[PDB]
Amino acid sequence: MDPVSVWGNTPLATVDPEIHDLIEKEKHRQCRGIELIASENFTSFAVIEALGSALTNKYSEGMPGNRYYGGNEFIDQIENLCRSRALQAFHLDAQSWGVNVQPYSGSPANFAAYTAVLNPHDRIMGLDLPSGGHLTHGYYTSGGKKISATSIYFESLPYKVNSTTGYIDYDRLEEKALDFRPKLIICGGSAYPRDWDYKRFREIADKCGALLLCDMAHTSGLVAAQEVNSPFEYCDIVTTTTHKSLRGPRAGMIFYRKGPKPPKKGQPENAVYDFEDKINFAVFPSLQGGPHNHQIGALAVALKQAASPGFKAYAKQVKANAVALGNYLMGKGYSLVTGGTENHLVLWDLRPLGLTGNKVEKLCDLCNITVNKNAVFGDSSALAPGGVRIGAPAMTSRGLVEKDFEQIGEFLHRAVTLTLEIQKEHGKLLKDFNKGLVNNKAIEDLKADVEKFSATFDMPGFLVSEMKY
Amino acid sequence: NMDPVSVWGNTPLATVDPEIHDLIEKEKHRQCRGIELIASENFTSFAVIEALGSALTNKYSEGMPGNRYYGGNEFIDQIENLCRSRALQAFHLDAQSWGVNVQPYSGSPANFAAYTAVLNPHDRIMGLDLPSGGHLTHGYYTSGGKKISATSIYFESLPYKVNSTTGYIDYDRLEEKALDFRPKLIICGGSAYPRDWDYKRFREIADKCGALLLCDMAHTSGLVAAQEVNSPFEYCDIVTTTTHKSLRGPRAGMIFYRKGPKPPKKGQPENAVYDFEDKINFAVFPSLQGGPHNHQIGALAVALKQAASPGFKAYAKQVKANAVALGNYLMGKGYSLVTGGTENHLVLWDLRPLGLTGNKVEKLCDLCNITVNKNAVFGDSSALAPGGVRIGAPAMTSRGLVEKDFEQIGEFLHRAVTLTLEIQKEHGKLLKDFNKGLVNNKAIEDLKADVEKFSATFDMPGFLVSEMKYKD
Amino acid sequence: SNMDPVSVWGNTPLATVDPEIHDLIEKEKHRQCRGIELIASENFTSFAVIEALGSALTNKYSEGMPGNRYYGGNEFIDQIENLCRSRALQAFHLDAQSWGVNVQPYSGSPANFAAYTAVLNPHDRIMGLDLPSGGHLTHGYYTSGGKKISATSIYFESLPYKVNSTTGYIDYDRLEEKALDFRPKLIICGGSAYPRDWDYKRFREIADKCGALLLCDMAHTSGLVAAQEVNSPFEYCDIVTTTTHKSLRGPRAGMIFYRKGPKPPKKGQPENAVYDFEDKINFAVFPSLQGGPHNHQIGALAVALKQAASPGFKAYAKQVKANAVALGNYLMGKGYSLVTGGTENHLVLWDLRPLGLTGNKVEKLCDLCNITVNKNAVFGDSSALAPGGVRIGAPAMTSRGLVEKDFEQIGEFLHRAVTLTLEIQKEHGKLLKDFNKGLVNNKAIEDLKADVEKFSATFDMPGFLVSEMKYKD
Amino acid sequence: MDPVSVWGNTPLATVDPEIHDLIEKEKHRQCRGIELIASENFTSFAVIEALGSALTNKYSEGMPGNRYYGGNEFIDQIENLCRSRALQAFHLDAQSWGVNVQPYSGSPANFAAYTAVLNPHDRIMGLDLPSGGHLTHGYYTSGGKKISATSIYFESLPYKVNSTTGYIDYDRLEEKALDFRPKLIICGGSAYPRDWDYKRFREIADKCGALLLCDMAHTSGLVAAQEVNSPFEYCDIVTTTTHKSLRGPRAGMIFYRKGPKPPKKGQPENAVYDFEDKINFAVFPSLQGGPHNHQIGALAVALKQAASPGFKAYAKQVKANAVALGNYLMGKGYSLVTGGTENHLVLWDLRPLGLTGNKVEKLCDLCNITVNKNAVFGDSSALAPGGVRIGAPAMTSRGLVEKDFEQIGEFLHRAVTLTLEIQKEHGKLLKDFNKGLVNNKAIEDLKADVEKFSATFDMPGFLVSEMKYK
Numbered sequence A: 001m002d003p004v005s006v007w008g009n010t011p012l013a014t015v016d017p018e019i020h021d022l023i024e025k026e027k028h029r030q031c032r033g034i035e036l037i038a039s040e041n042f043t044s045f046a047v048i049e050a051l052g053s054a055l056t057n058k059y060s061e062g063m064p065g066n067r068y069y070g071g072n073e074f075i076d077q078i079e080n081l082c083r084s085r086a087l088q089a090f091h092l093d094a095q096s097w098g099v100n101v102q103p104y105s106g107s108p109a110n111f112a113a114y115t116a117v118l119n120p121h122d123r124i125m126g127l128d129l130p131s132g133g134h135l136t137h138g139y140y141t142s143g144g145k146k147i148s149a150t151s152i153y154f155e156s157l158p159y160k161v162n163s164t165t166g167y168i169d170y171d172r173l174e175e176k177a178l179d180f181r182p183k184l185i186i187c188g189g190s191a192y193p194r195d196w197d198y199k200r201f202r203e204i205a206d207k208c209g210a211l212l213l214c215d216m217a218h219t220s221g222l223v224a225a226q227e228v229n230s231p232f233e234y235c236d237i238v239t240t241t242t243h244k245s246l247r248g249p250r251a252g253m254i255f256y257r258k259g260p261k262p263p264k265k266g267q268p269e270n271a272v273y274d275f276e277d278k279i280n281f282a283v284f285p286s287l288q289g290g291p292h293n294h295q296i297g298a299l300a301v302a303l304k305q306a307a308s309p310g311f312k313a314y315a316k317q318v319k320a321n322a323v324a325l326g327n328y329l330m331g332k333g334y335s336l337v338t339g340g341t342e343n344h345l346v347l348w349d350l351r352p353l354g355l356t357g358n359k360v361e362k363l364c365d366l367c368n369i370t371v372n373k374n375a376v377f378g379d380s381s382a383l384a385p386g387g388v389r390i391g392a393p394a395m396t397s398r399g400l401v402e403k404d405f406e407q408i409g410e411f412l413h414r415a416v417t418l419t420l421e422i423q424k425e426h427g428k429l430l431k432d433f434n435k436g437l438v439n440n441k442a443i444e445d446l447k448a449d450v451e452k453f454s455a456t457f458d459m460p461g462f463l464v465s466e467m468k469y
Numbered sequence B: 001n002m003d004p005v006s007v008w009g010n011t012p013l014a015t016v017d018p019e020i021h022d023l024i025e026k027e028k029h030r031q032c033r034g035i036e037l038i039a040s041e042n043f044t045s046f047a048v049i050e051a052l053g054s055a056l057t058n059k060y061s062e063g064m065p066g067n068r069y070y071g072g073n074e075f076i077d078q079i080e081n082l083c084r085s086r087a088l089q090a091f092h093l094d095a096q097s098w099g100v101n102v103q104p105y106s107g108s109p110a111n112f113a114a115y116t117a118v119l120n121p122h123d124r125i126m127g128l129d130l131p132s133g134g135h136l137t138h139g140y141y142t143s144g145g146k147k148i149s150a151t152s153i154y155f156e157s158l159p160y161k162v163n164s165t166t167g168y169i170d171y172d173r174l175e176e177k178a179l180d181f182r183p184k185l186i187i188c189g190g191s192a193y194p195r196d197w198d199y200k201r202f203r204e205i206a207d208k209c210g211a212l213l214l215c216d217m218a219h220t221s222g223l224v225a226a227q228e229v230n231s232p233f234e235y236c237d238i239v240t241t242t243t244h245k246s247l248r249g250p251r252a253g254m255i256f257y258r259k260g261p262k263p264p265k266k267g268q269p270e271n272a273v274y275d276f277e278d279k280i281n282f283a284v285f286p287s288l289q290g291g292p293h294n295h296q297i298g299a300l301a302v303a304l305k306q307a308a309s310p311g312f313k314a315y316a317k318q319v320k321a322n323a324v325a326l327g328n329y330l331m332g333k334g335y336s337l338v339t340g341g342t343e344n345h346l347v348l349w350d351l352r353p354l355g356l357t358g359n360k361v362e363k364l365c366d367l368c369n370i371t372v373n374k375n376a377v378f379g380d381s382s383a384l385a386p387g388g389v390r391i392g393a394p395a396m397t398s399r400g401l402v403e404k405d406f407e408q409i410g411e412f413l414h415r416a417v418t419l420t421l422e423i424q425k426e427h428g429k430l431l432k433d434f435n436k437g438l439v440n441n442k443a444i445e446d447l448k449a450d451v452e453k454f455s456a457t458f459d460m461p462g463f464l465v466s467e468m469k470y471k472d
Numbered sequence C: 001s002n003m004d005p006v007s008v009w010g011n012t013p014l015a016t017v018d019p020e021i022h023d024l025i026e027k028e029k030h031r032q033c034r035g036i037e038l039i040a041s042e043n044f045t046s047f048a049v050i051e052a053l054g055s056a057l058t059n060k061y062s063e064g065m066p067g068n069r070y071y072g073g074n075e076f077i078d079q080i081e082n083l084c085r086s087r088a089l090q091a092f093h094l095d096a097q098s099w100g101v102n103v104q105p106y107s108g109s110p111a112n113f114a115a116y117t118a119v120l121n122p123h124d125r126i127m128g129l130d131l132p133s134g135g136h137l138t139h140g141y142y143t144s145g146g147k148k149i150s151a152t153s154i155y156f157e158s159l160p161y162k163v164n165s166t167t168g169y170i171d172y173d174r175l176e177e178k179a180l181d182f183r184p185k186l187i188i189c190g191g192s193a194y195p196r197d198w199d200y201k202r203f204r205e206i207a208d209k210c211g212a213l214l215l216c217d218m219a220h221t222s223g224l225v226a227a228q229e230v231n232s233p234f235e236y237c238d239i240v241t242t243t244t245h246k247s248l249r250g251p252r253a254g255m256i257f258y259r260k261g262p263k264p265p266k267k268g269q270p271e272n273a274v275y276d277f278e279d280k281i282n283f284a285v286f287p288s289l290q291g292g293p294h295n296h297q298i299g300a301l302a303v304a305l306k307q308a309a310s311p312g313f314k315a316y317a318k319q320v321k322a323n324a325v326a327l328g329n330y331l332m333g334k335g336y337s338l339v340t341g342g343t344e345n346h347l348v349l350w351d352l353r354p355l356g357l358t359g360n361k362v363e364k365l366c367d368l369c370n371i372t373v374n375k376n377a378v379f380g381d382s383s384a385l386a387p388g389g390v391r392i393g394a395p396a397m398t399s400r401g402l403v404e405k406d407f408e409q410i411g412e413f414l415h416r417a418v419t420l421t422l423e424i425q426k427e428h429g430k431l432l433k434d435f436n437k438g439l440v441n442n443k444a445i446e447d448l449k450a451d452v453e454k455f456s457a458t459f460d461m462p463g464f465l466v467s468e469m470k471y472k473d
Numbered sequence D: 001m002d003p004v005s006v007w008g009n010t011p012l013a014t015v016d017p018e019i020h021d022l023i024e025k026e027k028h029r030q031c032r033g034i035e036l037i038a039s040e041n042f043t044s045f046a047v048i049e050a051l052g053s054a055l056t057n058k059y060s061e062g063m064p065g066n067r068y069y070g071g072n073e074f075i076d077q078i079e080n081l082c083r084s085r086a087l088q089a090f091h092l093d094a095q096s097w098g099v100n101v102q103p104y105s106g107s108p109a110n111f112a113a114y115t116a117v118l119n120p121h122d123r124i125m126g127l128d129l130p131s132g133g134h135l136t137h138g139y140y141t142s143g144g145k146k147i148s149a150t151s152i153y154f155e156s157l158p159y160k161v162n163s164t165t166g167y168i169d170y171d172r173l174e175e176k177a178l179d180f181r182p183k184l185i186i187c188g189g190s191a192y193p194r195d196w197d198y199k200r201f202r203e204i205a206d207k208c209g210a211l212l213l214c215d216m217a218h219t220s221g222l223v224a225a226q227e228v229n230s231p232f233e234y235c236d237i238v239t240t241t242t243h244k245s246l247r248g249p250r251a252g253m254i255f256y257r258k259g260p261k262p263p264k265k266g267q268p269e270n271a272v273y274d275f276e277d278k279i280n281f282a283v284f285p286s287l288q289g290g291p292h293n294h295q296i297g298a299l300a301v302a303l304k305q306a307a308s309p310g311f312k313a314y315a316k317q318v319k320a321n322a323v324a325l326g327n328y329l330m331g332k333g334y335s336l337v338t339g340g341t342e343n344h345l346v347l348w349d350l351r352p353l354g355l356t357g358n359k360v361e362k363l364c365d366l367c368n369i370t371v372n373k374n375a376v377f378g379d380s381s382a383l384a385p386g387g388v389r390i391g392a393p394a395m396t397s398r399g400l401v402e403k404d405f406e407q408i409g410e411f412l413h414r415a416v417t418l419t420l421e422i423q424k425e426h427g428k429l430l431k432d433f434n435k436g437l438v439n440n441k442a443i444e445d446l447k448a449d450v451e452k453f454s455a456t457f458d459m460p461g462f463l464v465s466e467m468k469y470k
């Protein structure tokens, strides 16, 4: 065999220079560009140290103090600490709320949450994907093609935003819920630029007999910082990712109510919530196997970080940065969904200009401007949807303030002005528009300007001064 | 006022979070000061860990390489491409005949994705019964009818069993059951089965009943990569696996699927090609998962390189030799091993002839720094107090232990079980009474000290012991 | 310990084998011709139909299709079933290369469940008219409280469409909107208490927009359809189901019509594409859902389908519609509220809530007066026990020969019944147990029963000779 | 409009001469041949008079006293009498049993019974169709094709008879039930020639947690006459048709337990059965609409007839006739599944002779001998199965006794010998064999002998001229 030191203790740069080289290049990409994917962030080195740790070695199926394996003395303390810090980060009373921190990621957390409270084929309603909801909110297409497993194993009827204002159509939602009678109503979304009227969602849920779940994955950092409405006030269950605005590792959690139910006509006195055992069982043994304890430890670190005054100031800045970027784009005459934002992102409708989102995402990516084409209301094609989604969390984490985001706006303005000029000269068909991308001097200049701008800012997670490139 | 970036973002865990830092340091200590015998556990390499804890965690990359839903994946695509190519290479697969998806978060998501790819809800599956050695996700429901795995809720499961006396898979009963039940999918591979699999026979059975054949090689994938056990790829349509067990990688999953022309079947169009790739990819994303965890994928690409090396082959040989040597020691003491030995990395130990349940042995061992898990054995209904303990060699073999060290582990386990027997005789079989013997017990203290001394004489992969906070 | 002679058990009349059942049937015969039968789904079928219904045809097992049976001995059963199917196509003026029919469903609800089983997998999506809006149980009925009632809401995923709250007409825009979000595999039209005709053309437009199959359940108006007195669903629907005992005036049975031959031009469908319903629908009926056909029903149905094709039957269906209108006009001449303010078919749906009444009260008092109706849900109802309406149909009494002025008398009898219901309620309270107290020893109920009976006995009765009947007064 | 008397009172022979002629030809066919379909019977004129009556005109959804329509004063009394005569015919205590008599037929009864106690995709086990079970007992084929909706809306795992004895393999049933964990186990069958160990079925159901349902459709008449084991002693639910050995109209019935549950380790004290409301709801409003009241009335007549001493003697004779036919066939060296019968039918395995049942059924049909081809153990083809099923109820109703059924045995022996000869001349292929079914002198002679034989017997189901006084 090989001595332990050789295969087991040698650094990555020697054991696997090919992968090491690719990681170093990805590290250089991350701080040499403008990273505007609304679901991305740059997590802390401390989170990354817990992530890449011996915690990966441990099997710990079960719950702390009730495991299927020996050896979990410290894994249990880690998971317990993570759970308690999660309640604290979101200002929850442990007698009123519990949390499962084992979901591998956001989509597993939602599927487990649904499995906990729903039987196969029970009805759900979530925000329609083109209106800003997530895949796992029951997404099938307007052509009736079932995409998400949440529209396969359950019966989805999505609700939509107002086609002209972009705000959730609460009236239609209530009418729909009353006809369809969902077992579960989901709120929260992936590309909705406004806050959520959780009070109205509760009102509606109560009127049709549904459970109410909020998926706060995108805004969970703003929620912890109390910079947006808290779903916990009104929802039975709250799921979330931990890697977005929360700035943690890639993981999920499922919060659930505990204790006495609020008085409701038709329900016994002393009625208590009964989510905890079902939610735990749905994560394990129903759906997952071994928890990823390096994720839980990393999560515990990020949850402590999210409770700090500094994180709260970061969340304020994210919102202020998104507003300042949005105001810049509208000041150039561009069209934002709902005409502004209340959170970390803006949804920018490109159809009034003539372009689809893949065109500007492709050109932007050539300029080290990382966005993602994103569905907008009415869209039927995931290849060429009508908009781009831009978020502030990632570059806010690198220290940027409003003026820097106005310069980001300026770069996007240039990128889109180039996009239209390439379209007005080489056509609207895709491959014909690709022609204007090869050896484009204005792209190279925009790229050079973007790299120059990006390199002026700090980078969490790792030392620029030690990276290979 | 926002924190300066370095203050929250560039400072070490030791400073940002002393509590978690200390707990990770205690766990690192616990990992090298005991004997780790959980068959599904391993100690992965520092190189794997360096990729796992990396900026790769920052990137959203839904889709496939070259077909993503986000910009910025120039290097993610190369890493995932590399990871998939090394996966095929590790298992000696022709890329015209096999593809792989390396995005599943873990083994259970890999299986549920593979099922979702090829099955509609409520379709029929057949896997090894859990008390016979099969995994949760192979359709586990209890002998009392209680649906446990979601793979028994969203699909219709009919488990097959081992022979009640011999402990080997009853292939005749499996075929008879399969022909009556008519499953869409037959699953092989196990979690607590100590023998190799007659995959050729599984193929014949699957052909007779029209079923797909999937092997879950999570436990033995390391031995398969080293060609130390039967390869499921010769006969199975689909192979799922985890990567953190005998394969010694990160925690992740992998789905392998055939590609290219299908073999001849009467009633098949000629020039018929497999059609798994698109379905399997689609099942993983956008059907079930969201963003890949690229730090896992990167770490996996590193582990797959390490598993394709001569030293890993010799590791896999040693793992098997250690399990055998340990099984022989235990059996020499009169202990019952299911199937009377092993052909892989684990032994399944039936404690019932001793008048013991595995939770008692597990608890006592844990106090002695011997880390095992209680395990169901044939006929068990209690997951709380099943009739067995399961012992594996991958983890301690990765620390450099050879047969004589595993005979020593056999003796420690012998002492552990003898002690458990003594506690029970003094205080009683009830768990509340038995626990009364676990407190201030000098022989537990003594066995623990002996285990810690033995365990401390071996190297540890993954981190430098000279660097750890708790060296004593 | 000996076997009875065959004739003793097997050839003796009901009147001697079973005096108690014979007497009860004689009392039901008396009941049927001595009151006013206004249940919209009831009719009085012919003696000829009844003679086929009670026949040796009941003795035969004939699973399968004519010429492809699982039993021998079907030489004549095959000819009867073929004649029934061909007469079914002819009664609805269907080209046999464009339409086929299955005449084995035991009744209307089996017919629908089979039609759905043929074209749907379990949990597939369906949209039918909401029951309080006029749709049938088997059209996906679950309550506004979310309780699944019909198995069609258990084995399939239902989303009902509704009428406009104020007008009572189907809200076609809301249906289209709902269909586009819900994406049903099947849209159902036809109803049980919808008093207007159906815009089948619009249903086809909606169904094509969402890629759904389109099925019409014409159970209630099938007689009016055969007579070409209402819109024909066959122009626009893929599948048409129906009972045969309602306005069609036959036995209790069901039928499933389905298209055959080339499919009309649709972008995305291959050229030379043909319908593929026949095998699927037959298989759903048998072996999937039913066992042996009820050949006495099929024979009787064959008789009814011949009778439905006659000039006299078309005149019947015109008189049914004229009678319903005359009755509706009389009722709203008194200020009563009919849903949609009138009718285009055989029934009216009478919303009693503006009177402060529920249908179960009116139904109970009517029954005591020999006026046979049924309480019936109206828009917004949640209670099947005490719904807000009563439904009145013309088919049964029209079959006894009643014309418009007779139906205006019926309206007056109904007006008197509702007035008495109001007085009993005013005097005895609105709670059911208190209202019931006013139904005992009530002279006006006695008087109205007497007037109804004397009116009722002035008309003929199909199905049996009143001159042979045991209870002639 | 036609006067009422023209369209509505004129007899069938004038309104519709075509259908009248076909019915008359069918009556002639029924009394001129030998009717051996085990599921067929000749019902009484009294039953038929109730079936063809003004009861067909009434809508009566709901239960007696709780209808969705007015006017049910007398339909309620008819249905109540039907239900109580159903309990009486099967010697059931009304405190311990209820019955729903609205199922349109046997298959509707079973699907409703299952819908009452099962959720979609719940697990059931019934006797495999080639082993003798019914379509509605979860039938999918050995090639895995779902055939019955009971294998589509529910999850079926059939249990089989012993391959070599033809008797149900109870040990394998138990083993299967323990592995599969069905919610419902069904017993009773369509082509099983032996009685059922209901005691063992109860033991197996108690052991795996399942409800136990008997579909007694084929033997219900023998059950009412207490000539076979009663399923009611051990089963939670008993479904049945009424038109087979029970000699009634085509209808279904669902019996269900009521009252205190028998002592069971785990069940709370004072536990009561809770089937009634669920069974009623499953029939209506879940699955059916309006009851067919003319069937309910005709059923009430048949149930009174089934309670009689003469019907008990009929049931004895059915069983004696099946035994005598079975012994005659075996005496010719033919193979019967299980080597005999304990009920009304014999299942005849034609494979040892190189024959499939469709050939025998076709030939027999040409000779006015009405049988049905029938699957036997191992069969995959429904078109050309391995056997023929022969039943005694119908001929017995015409007064035939053991010697008459031995002559039937001889006609069957002649028919099969004649089939084994048309297959030497013409070949095993259907289209080939089929050529010998035209201008066959032996077929013609056999048909004439069968005719002469059948014409010597009485026939129920028309009115006797002397009784034209009442």
Ligand SMILES: Nc1nc2c(c(=O)[nH]1)N(C=O)[C@@H](CNc1ccc(C(=O)N[C@@H](CCC(=O)O)C(=O)O)cc1)CN2
Pocket (backbone or CB within 6 Å): A061, A068, A285, A289, B130, B131, B132, B133, B134, B135, B136, B137, B142, B148, B191, B192, B373, B374, B375, B376, B382, B383, B384, B385
């Ligand atoms: N053969 C085999 N052994 C194995 C596993 C496996 O999948 N297969 N496991 C990992 O792969 C662990 C055991 N996984 C299990 C998880 C839940 C239950 C179970 O029956 N849970 C019920 C009862 C709980 C109780 O009794 O306290 C429940 O959760 O309610 C059994 C085994 C370790 N050993």
Ligand SMILES: Nc1nc2c(c(=O)[nH]1)N(C=O)[C@@H](CNc1ccc(C(=O)N[C@@H](CCC(=O)O)C(=O)O)cc1)CN2
Pocket (backbone or CB within 6 Å): C063, C070, C286, C287, C291, D128, D129, D130, D131, D132, D133, D134, D135, D136, D141, D147, D190, D191, D372, D373, D374, D375, D381, D382, D383, D389
């Ligand atoms: N054991 C048993 N015998 C019985 C019946 C039964 O239900 N069970 N039957 C009454 O209860 C009749 C047979 N009923 C059957 C109906 C359909 C199929 C069947 O498998 N049909 C397929 C194959 C068609 C073909 O091969 O041509 C199909 O319809 O697609 C089999 C038997 C008479 N004998």
Ligand SMILES: Cc1ncc(COP(=O)(O)O)c(CNCC(=O)O)c1O
Pocket (backbone or CB within 6 Å): A059, A288, A289, A290, A291, B039, B040, B106, B107, B108, B109, B135, B137, B189, B190, B191, B216, B217, B218, B219, B242, B251, B252
């Ligand atoms: C055969 C098999 N398949 C899949 C899994 C699941 O892997 P994850 O825990 O990553 O989901 C396991 C885990 N079994 C763990 C054990 O046997 O102890 C397994 O044994």
Ligand SMILES: Cc1ncc(COP(=O)(O)O)c(CNCC(=O)O)c1O
Pocket (backbone or CB within 6 Å): A038, A039, A105, A106, A107, A108, A110, A134, A136, A188, A189, A190, A191, A215, A216, A217, A218, A241, A250, A251, B060, B289, B290, B291, B292
């Ligand atoms: C609202 C929401 N919920 C759950 C998830 C799932 O997280 P995972 O990818 O870890 O499964 C996402 C991810 N959406 C990513 C994006 O909006 O770009 C999300 O936006």
Ligand SMILES: Cc1ncc(COP(=O)(O)O)c(CNCC(=O)O)c1O
Pocket (backbone or CB within 6 Å): C061, C290, C291, C292, C293, D038, D039, D105, D106, D107, D108, D134, D136, D188, D189, D190, D215, D216, D217, D218, D241, D250, D251
């Ligand atoms: C056991 C059994 N159960 C139910 C039925 C169905 O009855 P209906 O055909 O009325 O739906 C049958 C009919 N089997 C007919 C035969 O054996 O020939 C049956 O044999």
Ligand SMILES: Cc1ncc(COP(=O)(O)O)c(CNCC(=O)O)c1O
Pocket (backbone or CB within 6 Å): C040, C041, C107, C108, C109, C110, C136, C138, C190, C191, C192, C193, C217, C218, C219, C220, C243, C252, C253, D059, D288, D289, D290, D291
């Ligand atoms: C539209 C419609 N479809 C099907 C049926 C069912 O017929 P059966 O009862 O034979 O199952 C009805 C009966 N409804 C009766 C009524 O409206 O009063 C109906 O109105």
